[PDB]
């Protein structure tokens, strides 16, 4: 893997520009501040304030220092925009307000490629488009950069127009201070596509799933759901911790040993052959486009669908049992 | 469920009665200065400082203020012996340290039930067997208790040839701080098998090769290790944080409406319904003995498949670009 770290991206390469860093949530506000800090000139695109949530946020970016500009006024004060919109928004936010103020030369960003990859947003072929993801939350984006200590980070470039489409987003990589931990070279098809399948087949329905599944199976042999809560959820977290310490070696090691043999002898029961052909299905549905149509299709029809799992995982007994359980540890 | 608090239990039940606990690893540690800090009478059993680690943790026990024994001198000291010995140790130790002292109207317990439960342990009809379960490591049970904030744990009694075993039990619950949590009642069958089988379902077994069958197969599809790592393996700490405070709603209240639709649909194709049967046959041979009984076979010829298999999981690519990955994010 290419990394790329500080004695590779030249921060003076921005002196004399406007960055526009539309949105200021989760990584709006985290990579705005660190632009500002790193000497560069930032404009924060925001809409106009017109309810509380506008206004409130519009009042925190000047708190924190920062100019707030309506969307079309950022992005034509600006010569590279970084949209950190929600990704479900961003195409009409890029189609109206800022599409048509968009020059030659100037450089499009994005910290998820899924809009640029999947032909939401399509920029002039004039325009350069980079990606720099980072691999930390907001809050751990902006508070890292305050101790002098990077995050690592993803780098990709969609179009090189300028012939330094490269270098300015990894100029933009060290404004947010990716580059001091270290930057892995990739691509909005990469990043996307291991994103969604990550999300699906592990972080998310993966394991909701293979905790229900558990839950759900103690449960309809008859033991007690205040038990089956504290073996199937709650206990997770005490493994995920150690694993994302030290690898599944540490957590391993820090079990009992009848747990790492349980470990090693029924996990390849459960997660099976089976279920790796039916990972590398999902996969191939993200590969080839039919999950992004259906996403598309879903929002475009009232989200029926969405609505409708959503709220039968809520009448879920583990969330019922949960919510019992949980107020009696209220230092979580 | 039926709960138990701190108006449920008389700490003076054990007035004039000496506590044993039988080692002092993670709850040892824990529960023995927590019985001390409440009152009550406590010695520590441990084997006599034959080297650096048997004499640091006797060290530690006269460091902390408590007072350690020997094994036998414990047992024959106390009237209360609390086994807290590896759950792999506990029947030589019983047999060779504890047995021969017992006397009439003693209490044993436990804070696992699988010794008793499949008969490994088998304690004299005129000894009461208890057992409280923390659902906490021991480092919270302590740190938790000096905070005036209990851990939740569960209760169960095995014999009650005095009929004061419950009343003994929760007495000791009192004192390590779990009634002020609240204490739930439950079997030692129960405890034993649930805590298997979420072990090998889910907490350890399911969820390593879930990550693994995800990084594999984003590894064999052609894309980047260091990429498949973030996103099977590292970010699944966030996710899992979020399920640990609020459930599952919290979790997809909290990720984007890409991960939440991705969730709801796909997490069902990847835990089906043959996993949810294999669970059922999982949870079946931990039922039935046939589990316990393998576990005990593969530790009497000195755990060849234990060692082979944690061997092969060692030498796992996913460990290999871990290592490499967190030396690069020094905050592990
Ligand atoms: N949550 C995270 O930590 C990660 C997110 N990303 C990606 O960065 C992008 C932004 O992510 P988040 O920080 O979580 O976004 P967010 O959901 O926290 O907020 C987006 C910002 O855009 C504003 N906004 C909302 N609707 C708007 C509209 N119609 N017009 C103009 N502004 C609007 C919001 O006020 C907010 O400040 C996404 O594409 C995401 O996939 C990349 C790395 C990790
Ligand atoms: N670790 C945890 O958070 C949980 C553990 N439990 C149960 O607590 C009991 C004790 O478990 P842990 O504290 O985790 O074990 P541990 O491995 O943390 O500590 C073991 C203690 O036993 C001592 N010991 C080891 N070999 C000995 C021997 N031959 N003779 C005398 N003493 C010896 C050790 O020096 C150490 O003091 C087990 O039944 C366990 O299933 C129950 C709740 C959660
Ligand atoms: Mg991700
Ligand atoms: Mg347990
Ligand atoms: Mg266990
Ligand atoms: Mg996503």
């Given at each position: 893997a290419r990394?790329?770290?500080?004695?590779?991206?030249?921060?003076?390469?921005?002196?004399?520009?406007?960055?526009?860093?539309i949105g200021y949530g989760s990584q709006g506000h985290a990579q705005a501040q660190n632009l500002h800090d790193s000497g560069l000139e930032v404009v924060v695109g925001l809409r106009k304030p017109e309810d509380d949530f506008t206004t409130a946020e519009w009042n925190q970016?000047?708190?924190?220092?920062?100019?707030?500009?309506?969307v079309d006024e950022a992005a034509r004060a600006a010569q590279i925009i970084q949209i950190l919109v929600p990704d479900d928004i961003q195409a009409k936010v890029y189609r109206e307000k800022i599409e048509p103020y968009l020059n030659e030369g100037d450089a499009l960003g994005f910290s998820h490629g899924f809009n640029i990859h999947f032909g939401q947003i399509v920029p002039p072929p004039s325009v350069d488009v980079f990606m720099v993801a980072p691999k930390?939350?907001?809050?751990?984006?902006?508070?890292?950069?305050?101790?002098?200590?990077?995050?690592?980070?993803?780098?990709?470039?969609?179009?090189?127009?300028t012939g330094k489409a490269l270098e300015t987003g990894l100029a933009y990589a060290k404004g947010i201070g990716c580059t001091r931990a270290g930057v892995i070279a990739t691509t909005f098809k990469e990043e996307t596509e291991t994103?969604?399948?990550?999300?699906?087949?592990?972080?998310?329905?993966?394991?909701?799933?293979?905790?229900?599944?558990?839950?759900?199976?103690?449960?309809?042999?008859?033991?007690?759901?205040?038990?089956?809560?504290?073996?199937?959820?709650?206990?997770?977290?005490?493994?995920?911790?150690?694993?994302?310490?030290?690898?599944?070696?540490?957590?391993?090691?820090?079990?009992?040993?009848?747990?790492?043999?349980?470990?090693?002898?029924?996990?390849?029961?459960?997660?099976?052959?089976?279920?790796?052909?039916?990972?590398?299905?999902?996969?191939?549905?993200?590969?080839?486009?039919?999950?992004?149509?259906?996403?598309?299709?879903?929002?475009?029809?009232?989200?029926?669908?969405?609505?409708?799992?959503?709220?039968?995982?809520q009448e879920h007994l583990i969330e019922k049992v949960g919510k019992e359980l949980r107020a009696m540890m209220p230092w979580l």
């Open positions: 990394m790329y770290y500080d004695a590779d991206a030249n921060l003076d390469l921005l002196k004399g520009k406007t960055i526009a860093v970016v000047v708190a924190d220092g920062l100019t707030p500009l309506p930390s939350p907001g809050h751990l984006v902006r508070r890292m950069y305050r101790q002098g200590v990077g995050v690592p980070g993803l780098i990709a470039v969609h179009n090189d127009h994103d969604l399948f990550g999300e699906q087949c592990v972080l998310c329905g993966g394991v909701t799933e293979l905790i229900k599944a558990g839950f759900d199976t103690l449960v309809e042999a008859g033991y007690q759901p205040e038990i089956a809560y504290f073996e199937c959820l709650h206990e997770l977290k005490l493994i995920v911790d150690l694993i994302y310490e030290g690898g599944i070696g540490l957590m391993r090691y820090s079990v009992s040993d009848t747990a790492e043999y349980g470990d090693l002898t029924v996990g390849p029961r459960i997660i099976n052959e089976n279920t790796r052909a039916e990972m590398k299905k999902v996969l191939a549905a993200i590969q080839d486009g039919t999950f992004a149509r259906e996403l598309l299709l879903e929002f475009q029809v009232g989200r029926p669908v969405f609505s409708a799992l959503r709220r039968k995982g």
